[PDB]
Amino acid sequence: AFTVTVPKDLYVVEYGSNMTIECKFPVEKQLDLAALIVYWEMEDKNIIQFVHGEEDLKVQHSSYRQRARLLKDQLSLGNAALQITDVKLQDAGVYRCMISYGGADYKRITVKVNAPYAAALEHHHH
Amino acid sequence: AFTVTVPKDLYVVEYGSNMTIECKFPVEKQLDLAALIVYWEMEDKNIIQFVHGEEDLKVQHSSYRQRARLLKDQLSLGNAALQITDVKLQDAGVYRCMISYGGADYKRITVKVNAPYAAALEHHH
Numbered sequence: 538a539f540t541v542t543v544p545k546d547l548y549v550v551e552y553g554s555n556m557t558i559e560c561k562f563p564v565e566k567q568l569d570l571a572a573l574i575v576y577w578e579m580e581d582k583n584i585i586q587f588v589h590g591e592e593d594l595k596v597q598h599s600s601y602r603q604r605a606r607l608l609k610d611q612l613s614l615g616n617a618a619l620q621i622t623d624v625k626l627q628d629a630g631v632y633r634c635m636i637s638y639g640g641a642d643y644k645r646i647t648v649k650v651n652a653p654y655a656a657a658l659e660h661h662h663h
Numbered sequence: 664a665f666t667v668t669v670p671k672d673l674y675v676v677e678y679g680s681n682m683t684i685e686c687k688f689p690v691e692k693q694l695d696l697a698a699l700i701v702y703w704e705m706e707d708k709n710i711i712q713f714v715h716g717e718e719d720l721k722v723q724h725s726s727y728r729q730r731a732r733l734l735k736d737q738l739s740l741g742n743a744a745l746q747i748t749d750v751k752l753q754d755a756g757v758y759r760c761m762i763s764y765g766g767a768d769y770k771r772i773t774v775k776v777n778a779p780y781a782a783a784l785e786h787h788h
């Protein structure tokens with residue numbers, strides 16, 4: 538069966554830092570981009586949509602616009618890697634990677650965000 | 664772009680009753696069963712896994728054994744219908760139909776379960 542695997546299902550990230558979260562998928566001889574679909578979301582909010590060679594970048598939910606991207610070079614290695622920069626408290630939660638490549642699967646990754654009082658206070662109130 | 668559609672977003676069902684929840688996907692002329700994958704889940708629990716034209720029996724979550732099935736006849740018409748019998752309070756929540764058919768998409772369906780006090784009390788513990 539087509540299986541997606543996750544080397545780390547838990548990530549601890551410091552507020553303001555950047556993170557790369559990964560989902561692995563099997564690629565046999567060489568990757569066929571045209572047959573690949575990669576989708577990332579966090580709590581029903583679209584983050585990455587890569588379809589048959591192209592990403593619909595602008596559909597990324599507003600909270601992530603200009604903040605997250607898929608490392609395209611990694612796909613040829615069978616690694617769907619999502620990089621999010623300038624991590625916020627709001628970024629904490631359960632991420633899902635949905636992959637279709639001659640079969641389909643998805644996995645969950647949990648992200649925890651540590652933050653100092655100043656950031657926490659802002660998040661708390663605003 | 665491949666799109667899955669749900670005519671009905673919300674289902675309100677009575678405890679002990681039956682429900683059929685539907686997700687629609689486009690089938691051009693004749694269904695190519697080999698390319699189709701239909702997956703149904705609620706809160707990460709596997710309900711249905713239709714791959715290769717066949718349901719995966721041992722993969723369904725225990726809470727749904729004998730109560731849930733995909734109506735195979737409907738697939739050819741581009742309808743993935745999940746039929747659940749003997750609805751429980753535990754069945755209330757957000758369902759997801761994930762479909763791969765020469766493209767991929769998913770949709771969410773919300774189910775609310777009405778129940779009498781006795782059933783509710785048992786659920787409450």
Ligand SMILES: Cc1c(COc2cc(OCc3cccc(C#N)c3)c(CN3C[C@H](O)C[C@H]3C(=O)O)cc2Cl)cccc1-c1ccc2c(c1)OCCO2
Nearest residue numbers: 576635636637641642643644645702761762763767768769
């Ligand atoms: C993801 C996807 C599916 C997933 O369909 C399956 C999921 C499966 O599990 C999901 C699962 C099960 C249990 C735990 C987790 C976690 N945490 C995840 C299995 C059970 N699986 C059998 C294998 O052994 C793996 C195994 C498992 O890992 O448990 C089999 C199938 Cl067919 C089906 C159809 C479409 C898409 C998809 C892909 C990309 C998309 C998209 C939809 O729409 C939007 C655009 O992009």
